[PDB]
A paper describes a structure:
ICV, however, has only one major surface glycoprotein, the hemagglutinin-esterase-fusion (HEF) protein, which possesses all-in-one of receptor binding, receptor destroying and membrane fusion activities. To further evaluate the infectivity and transmissibility of IDV, we expressed and purified the ectodomain of D/OK HEF, and determined that it also uses 9-O-Acetyl-Sia as its receptor by glycan microarray. We also solved the crystal structure of D/OK HEF, both in its native state (resolution of 2.4 Å) and in complex with its receptor analogue (resolution of 3.1 Å), and the structure of the enzymatically inactive HEF (resolution of 2.4 Å) alone and in complex with two receptor analogs respectively (both resolutions of 2.2 Å). Indeed, our results show that IDV HEF is functionally and structurally similar to ICV HEF, but with some distinct characteristics.
In order to study the molecular basis of IDV HEF and its receptor / substrate binding mode we solved the native X-ray crystallography structures of wild type and mutant HEFs both at a resolution of 2.4 Å. Due to the presence of cacodylate buffer in the crystallization conditions, S57 in our IDV HEF structure is covalently modified by the addition of a dimethylarsenic group. The covalent modification of active site serine by arsenic was first reported by Ian Wilson’s group in 2003, when they solved the structure of an acetyl esterase, HerE, and its complex with the inhibitor dimethylarsinic acid, and illustrated the mechanism of the broad scope inhibition of serine hydrolases by As(V)-containing organic compounds. In our IDV HEF structure, IDV HEF is proteolytically cleaved into the subunits HEF1 and HEF2. To confirm the proteolytic processing, we isolated IDV HEF crystals and checked for HEF2 band both by SDS-PAGE and western blot with an antibody recognizing the hexa-His tag engineered at the C terminus. Furthermore, N-terminal amino acid sequencing of the HEF2 band revealed that the first five amino acids of HEF2 were IFGID, the same with ICV HEF. The exposed fusion peptide has also been observed previously in the HEF protein of ICV and in the cleavage site of IDV HEF structure. Unambiguous electron density was seen from the ninth residue (F9) of the fusion peptide.
Numbering used by the authors:
A (entry chain A), B (entry chain A), C (entry chain A): 3 to 193, 197 to 429
D (entry chain B), E (entry chain B), F (entry chain B): 9 to 157
Amino acid sequence: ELICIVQRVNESFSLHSGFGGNVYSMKTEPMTGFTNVTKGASVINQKDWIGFGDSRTDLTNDQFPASSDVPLAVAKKFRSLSGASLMLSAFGPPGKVDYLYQGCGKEKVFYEGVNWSPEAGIDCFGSNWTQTKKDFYSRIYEAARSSTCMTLVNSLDTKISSTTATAGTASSCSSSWMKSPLWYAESSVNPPQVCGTEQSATFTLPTSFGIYKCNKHVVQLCYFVYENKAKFNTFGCGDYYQNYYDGNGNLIGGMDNRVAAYRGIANAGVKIECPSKILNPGTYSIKSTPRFLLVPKRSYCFDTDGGYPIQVVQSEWSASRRSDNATEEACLQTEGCIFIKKTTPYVGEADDNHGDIEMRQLLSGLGNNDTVCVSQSGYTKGETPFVKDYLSPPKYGRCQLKTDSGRIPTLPSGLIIPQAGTDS
Amino acid sequence: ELICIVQRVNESFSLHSGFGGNVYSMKTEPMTGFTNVTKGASVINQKDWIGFGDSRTDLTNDQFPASSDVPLAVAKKFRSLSGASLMLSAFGPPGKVDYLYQGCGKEKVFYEGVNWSPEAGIDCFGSNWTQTKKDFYSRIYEAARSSTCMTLVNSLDTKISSTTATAGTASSCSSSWMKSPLWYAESSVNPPQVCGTEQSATFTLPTSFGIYKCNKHVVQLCYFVYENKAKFNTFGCGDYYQNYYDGNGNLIGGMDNRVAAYRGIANAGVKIECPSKILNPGTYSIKSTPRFLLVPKRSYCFDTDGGYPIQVVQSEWSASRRSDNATEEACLQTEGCIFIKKTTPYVGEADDNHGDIEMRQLLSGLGNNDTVCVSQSGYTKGETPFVKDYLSPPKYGRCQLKTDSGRIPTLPSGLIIPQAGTDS
Amino acid sequence: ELICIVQRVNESFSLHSGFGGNVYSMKTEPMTGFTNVTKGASVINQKDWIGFGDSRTDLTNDQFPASSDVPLAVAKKFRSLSGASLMLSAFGPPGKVDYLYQGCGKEKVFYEGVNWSPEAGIDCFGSNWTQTKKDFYSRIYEAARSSTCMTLVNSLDTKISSTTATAGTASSCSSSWMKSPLWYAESSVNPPQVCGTEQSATFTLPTSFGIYKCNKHVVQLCYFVYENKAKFNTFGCGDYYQNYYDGNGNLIGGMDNRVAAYRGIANAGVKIECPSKILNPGTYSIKSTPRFLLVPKRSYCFDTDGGYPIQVVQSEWSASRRSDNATEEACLQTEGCIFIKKTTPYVGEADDNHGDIEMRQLLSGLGNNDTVCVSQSGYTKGETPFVKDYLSPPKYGRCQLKTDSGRIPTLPSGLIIPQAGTDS
Amino acid sequence: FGLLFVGFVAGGVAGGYFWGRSNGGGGGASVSSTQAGFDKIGKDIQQLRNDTNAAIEGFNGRIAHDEQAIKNLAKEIEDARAEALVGELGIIRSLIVANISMNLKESLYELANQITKRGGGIAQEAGPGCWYVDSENCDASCKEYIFNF
Amino acid sequence: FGLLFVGFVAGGVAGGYFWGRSNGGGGGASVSSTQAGFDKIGKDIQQLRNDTNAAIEGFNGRIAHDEQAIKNLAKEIEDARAEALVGELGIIRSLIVANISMNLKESLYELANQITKRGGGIAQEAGPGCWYVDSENCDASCKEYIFNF
Amino acid sequence: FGLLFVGFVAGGVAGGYFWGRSNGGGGGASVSSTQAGFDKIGKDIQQLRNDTNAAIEGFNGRIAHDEQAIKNLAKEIEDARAEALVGELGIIRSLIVANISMNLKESLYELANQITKRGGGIAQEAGPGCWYVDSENCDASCKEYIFNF
Ligand SMILES: *[C@@H]1O[C@H](CO)[C@@H](O[C@@H]2O[C@H](CO)[C@@H](O[C@@H]3O[C@H](CO[C@H]4O[C@H](CO[C@H]5O[C@H](CO)[C@@H](O)[C@H](O)[C@@H]5O)[C@@H](O)[C@H](O[C@H]5O[C@H](CO)[C@@H](O)[C@H](O)[C@@H]5O)[C@@H]4O)[C@@H](O)[C@H](O)[C@@H]3O)[C@H](O)[C@H]2NC(C)=O)[C@H](O)[C@H]1NC(C)=O
Ligand SMILES: *[C@@H]1O[C@H](CO)[C@@H](O[C@@H]2O[C@H](CO)[C@@H](O[C@@H]3O[C@H](CO[C@H]4O[C@H](CO[C@H]5O[C@H](CO)[C@@H](O)[C@H](O)[C@@H]5O)[C@@H](O)[C@H](O[C@H]5O[C@H](CO)[C@@H](O)[C@H](O)[C@@H]5O)[C@@H]4O)[C@@H](O)[C@H](O)[C@@H]3O)[C@H](O)[C@H]2NC(C)=O)[C@H](O)[C@H]1NC(C)=O
Ligand SMILES: *[C@@H]1O[C@H](CO)[C@@H](O[C@@H]2O[C@H](CO)[C@@H](O)[C@H](O)[C@H]2NC(C)=O)[C@H](O)[C@H]1NC(C)=O
Ligand SMILES: *[C@@H]1O[C@H](CO)[C@@H](O[C@@H]2O[C@H](CO)[C@@H](O)[C@H](O)[C@H]2NC(C)=O)[C@H](O)[C@H]1NC(C)=O
Ligand SMILES: *[C@@H]1O[C@H](CO)[C@@H](O[C@@H]2O[C@H](CO)[C@@H](O)[C@H](O)[C@H]2NC(C)=O)[C@H](O)[C@H]1NC(C)=O
Ligand SMILES: *[C@@H]1O[C@H](CO)[C@@H](O[C@@H]2O[C@H](CO)[C@@H](O)[C@H](O)[C@H]2NC(C)=O)[C@H](O)[C@H]1NC(C)=O
Ligand SMILES: *[C@@H]1O[C@H](CO)[C@@H](O[C@@H]2O[C@H](CO)[C@@H](O)[C@H](O)[C@H]2NC(C)=O)[C@H](O)[C@H]1NC(C)=O
Ligand SMILES: *[C@@H]1O[C@H](CO)[C@@H](O[C@@H]2O[C@H](CO)[C@@H](O)[C@H](O)[C@H]2NC(C)=O)[C@H](O)[C@H]1NC(C)=O
């Protein structure tokens, strides 16, 4: 008698091919899957990141932790002071807190801006501080993406040629003036009879500031904006001009209405514009119309040793105050910048404007020790190489790829029967 | 008795190695091979491309299809008009057809230029329209490679300060003038006694035109060219100049013979040069010598949302007329531009200059629904990952790699015998 | 009776997994390993490289080979002359050897500079020739990385408008002057009563020089440097200026103290600065203060057909003479430049300064026919894909990757036993 | 027909591993049971399946570093990288399936080999998983001892 | 010497699958035929060869997206990509050859197994593709029935 | 228990390939020797090991072209490329180990097959590397001839 183990399959069994053997099975399980994506901010390396912030990350605040959007351990990683902002330190308007932001970290988190919004009501002849704000943070983000470190440079070496010009003051600016730019005006220039002498000045961007190497400086090259020549000529003779030059005499900034049309809004009066530029270290020169001279007195110092794409966190007040989205738009138009944005209003735990539940959730990743990817869609752990939807750039780290679930191959499970040869 | 199946090989059998088993065979067949490459133009995505053309792709032509280098279905994908050309619409010379080119497509096909060749005999004080042509299409191609869309902007907002200057006219320009630039001249400027006042003007490049976002504008910053100061001074006082400025007063274009040497060809008389520049949207300023002012009145609007490398098709007449190869040379010197060139003369079916058999073959790919790669060597289907010769860049899509046929591995065929173990 | 071969393993045996069979073994050997890295210079393709050098690679030297840091076969691949240097040929100072460097090679080796060091005591009103040196070689290296070829252009077509100005001469410059720039001065300009007329000049960078295509020129745009206006006004009227313009009048170089601060070192007297710039071919214009005009008379011609990262070899004297490290610093700050540096003093075989044992070792790779990678860490053969430490960029070729030795997988060796199934 | 072959069956009928018997009166008419006590196969399958984790963990643990400053998705490059990774996953799959196939077959050879050595040598092999047990020396309680049904 | 071995032959002599026989008078002198009616091997080979298309189609269907605006060929990068792809094709090849080898050998085991079960059990296996048929119970018409030559 | 199995042994005790014998008086008590004259295995192992060079040489000969003008190491990109290459080396390893495993096992089947054909057919196979030699027709000098110990 012939006795045999007999191998057989049903219509329920399907065939899976292998290199060196096939398998019959009834069930299949996918070989792998998608990694979840968490909204908000995080870091891939806890030992190399720096945060810059305000009261909402200031552990010295009297109402901490209820006033904070991050816990103690994350707060220690921020350079923050209540009331501060990059832009506030850039100009130093009267009575506002003037914090020296500085630090190093390949990954950077920027969480301020709000302490200079429309709510603060700073005037000082500003044409449009929101526009200035957007342009300023644009230049910061642009320089920071390629830099390891950043520091405020709270005082540039400056020198004015004029011996009669004196330091300007304005009622619209708390009866004093910015820390930067410095405003020098000539009392004797009267259009009467007396036109005055063209004003001159130098300013120096240093090759270093303390322990920080400077390869790049974000500075403002400010100028006055007039409605037309006629309105200008009630203050000075000729056309308004204020031009910025490098050490050779190349025009690098300013406003020259001897060649460029006046663009001052009608009947607004004199206004100041303050575009930010990224400049190399060196000594720069200024030529201005006799009556009014503006001279940069601060900068932000950056190196070019490299960095990762940065993270910018939405910095706005609760609904009760007047906010702007200048840092959002600055971030949006700048390469290598990732923006973290709330979907509900800012409602704080300490006050209206401090300690928001959504923001604490969005920032909680700052946070974790197992983040491997950070992107504009959020951050991931290193579970699988795949995600269900794209991770929007900017992004960096061990970042997952989008594939359809259908393309993920399977393996046989359940009752299994081997097969090889042609069986015929 | 021992009865055995016996396995044996000849000197004709060679051994092929495997991971987990070897194979003896007499014949081998290559595992895969090369994909053919077809010369001419095509697209990898029929649902996202746009063509810009003239009569040779104009389905409204009375002699269609015999006058056409593409069939009806491809023609519907072109924005074309008989007699038109990008450059003709750029300047708008008198009596020439003035078509508003506009459209969107990640893949772009440019098939005109010929309607402004030497044959057309346009003068209008042009120094060298062929040079202007090359420079113009260079800037178009450069901006189009990074753009999703393109539109003519047929009228810029302009403003001249002078209240006495009037609109210039020339016998060499059909007793009228271009649509762009506008020519304003001062009757009263006579070098006698009267020098006149420096002329001024602004022009605005808009942030949008209809439904099209503008991030970039191709415009011409024209100026007059004089042989020397002496020949200039029979028209005006001082040195000739015409300078273009941005809103701050940065010099962005023009010709200034107060600092730059005169370079006018001797005894040619006055000539106009019209280099194209890519400019951001904004309001720009002009300063000119009193007698002659030129002001840009048109542009081409582009976005920066991205595009693929473009395809430019040779646009020349039949042998009977006078052609140029300005668009060829513009394409050659511009990144991301692929040029389609005939190897035999243009011989048309409707006329001499319309409906050429070679061009219809070269354009027939526009065409197909299974093109996966487009390159300067031509286009391919997705048969294999390999080609016999390189695909010259520019190129995009699923593009094949060159390998020697010898490196393509083989598989055993014919009578086959397995082998494993050492057999000893 | 049952007789069986019995398979068994010890505690000394470990299990290795395979796809289609496992293996028990006692020993393991790593599957592959690291490729050694040799310090110094080399090439990946002996048929496409060019060297530029001085006496230390000059086979026509009377003391060859003892005066040489390379053997005969490598020397034939250098364009060298005793006493020569790129910079010496750039300016052509009196009595110094003036070699026409020219050649083609995708890989480039630069081994001079030393024949213009502080030791040579060239003055000629130089502000700081070491600074000039660094800036010059910076521009050479920058242009050479993207070029296939290079040639000295020993004479530019030049033209001065002034009919009274004569060719300058200096006691500090051997009672003559540089070949480049040319110095023209106006005898009659005396600040007495007579200010003189603004000086003008053109110079042309050609589109080719002999068989070499020029897409780029390295030229010096020199100017005089004065301590202040007061010290300048003992020579001329107004402020000092010397400005360089393109054919349209765009300022591309120079020094203009009408807008830029004077920066001359106090009581040093007049000095000349000579920064190098990379310029397109064309005709350029000059405007200068009446008394002193400087005009570029030479350039270095480069194409843009591509090249590999370059190799620059430390070019210094023996300890007895005064050296600089200007070419080191130029190389360090320039992308695509690899620097070869000795670790011991230069001690020669023919003289003190010729035929150094370490340099011959470092250059011996130039040399070999089996180099596949060249990097800032040195060069490798094609043994394995791995190295123990990183190969520092710049680098090119078949370059190895760093992995830890622990990650390199092993294979079973020694007595080996197969295993498959669950064995239970 | 005994471990070198897998046969098909219709609508109803359980799939799996069964006992099949042969001739007798000349000529007989064959017979197939309703699955045995092969719990060793059940355990071997579970072990083999769980052993696939090593190959899968290696793949999951491999994610390429990247860095994009760009603000708009490079969709086609993105998709190309995925496709390559999926292709790599495809090869690994094929290797794992074969690895299960081969090791299961070897586990089935081990099952048959134990059966051979329990009726030694009343069994007499006829290819893997087949035996000529001569119903002379071996009654019914005998074959029950040898083949456990 | 029977399915675990492949032997070599000289100048003439056909290669392939043959019948080989043994002793007799003591000692005999062996003998090898001139190929059998193994059309099952012919069919199995054709099927195995055609089954290679699946692995090849997967490779051909995989072409990486690219985009170059550059005007001059990056020859060395170009060649490097090809070399990697060729390397990948090399591995697949090695897998396919083994896959044919192993499945053909299994098809040959199936051939031998059918022969065993046709002289059951006059056959008596002696390793795959070998049998001790005792020329006592089995004459010549018998062996003809069992081994088809 | 005979070529389909690998068993473990304690502290002392040599690992390798041994001769093991069975019953007798009913019931017997088994016995395992101290390794045989299997020099064929020694030679086959050496050949198999040296054959691994082909797969390794192919891997070593494959180094991707590159070109960096950058002055500071891109460490993370650098490490990612290495990791991928190491991953590729991991797969090749797994293939080579299996390739040795399978070809060694086949070499062991060839060893057993030669032994079968030397006591033909006093041997009688009982799975690979096992035999029922009936101590009736075959004394001791006989088994010595057949199994070389
Ligand atoms: C004082 O200065 C203030 C700052 O300049 C100025 O305020 C600005 O005023 C203008 C005009 O009213 C507003 O213009 C509007 O801008 C929006 C936003 O555009 C930006 O974002 C969109 C995409 O938005 C979509 O997605 C976001 C999420 O990411 C959603 O929230 C949103 O709802 C949309 O669904 C983007 O398309 C825009 O991109 C443009 O610009 C970039 C470059 O910057 C280009 O790359 C791109 O091609 C395109 O041209 C842009 O990034 C826009 O959607 C509207 O159509 C409109 O243009 C500004 O928002 C506003 N900004 C601020 C900070 O307040 C004041 O008007 C001025 N005061 C006075 C008196 O002059
Ligand atoms: C009015 O303006 C007209 C336009 O400026 C002007 O006409 C020009 O005049 C010049 C001088 O006579 C001619 O110069 C010649 O140009 C050719 C072509 O050069 C271009 O192509 C070559 C490669 O050509 C090879 O391959 C092509 C196929 O691709 C073949 O057809 C051909 O036969 C060759 O085998 C290329 O090497 C050139 O590259 C140069 O320029 C680019 C940048 O633009 C650089 O990247 C590169 O390094 C190099 O410098 C170029 O792309 C050239 O081969 C000749 O040597 C010569 O230079 C122009 O062809 C001509 N153009 C037109 C449109 O007519 C008129 O002269 C002027 N009228 C007056 C009175 O002034
Ligand atoms: C290895 O070879 C086998 C046998 O040629 C292939 O098995 C075939 O696979 C297809 C689809 O998977 C089945 O429909 C055929 O019936 C199979 N043929 C046989 C005879 O079983 C197997 O696909 C190959 N392995 C791989 C990964 O390609
Ligand atoms: C898998 O192992 C086998 C056996 O070691 C390798 O077969 C050898 O291959 C070379 C060249 O292909 C032949 O010349 C040798 O004669 C073969 N050895 C034997 C004993 O047959 C096989 O190459 C290995 N597979 C791979 C892909 O490396
Ligand atoms: C192929 O399958 C076998 C069997 O499932 C795997 O062998 C296991 O490997 C682990 C670690 O290597 C051992 O600890 C287990 O004991 C093995 N199981 C058995 C039953 O032997 C093998 O790893 C798989 N091959 C690969 C490369 O994954
Ligand atoms: C083919 O055979 C399988 C098992 O050999 C049958 O699967 C069983 O189905 C029932 C009800 O669906 C389950 O509860 C059992 O757990 C299954 N058995 C196993 C081992 O998984 C299947 O129903 C059969 N299919 C057909 C069409 O008859
Ligand atoms: C080795 O054997 C093969 C076949 O086993 C011989 O191949 C035959 O050759 C003839 C004439 O060349 C062909 O028409 C047949 O079709 C071939 N047979 C097969 C099965 O393909 C081959 O000639 C022999 N080689 C030597 C050197 O004797
Ligand atoms: C397990 O077995 C192996 C061999 O089967 C033993 O290895 C031998 O050890 C001695 C001394 O260490 C060496 O000189 C021999 O060359 C080894 N033999 C072989 C074949 O390599 C090993 O000692 C045993 N291990 C234990 C723990 O008993």
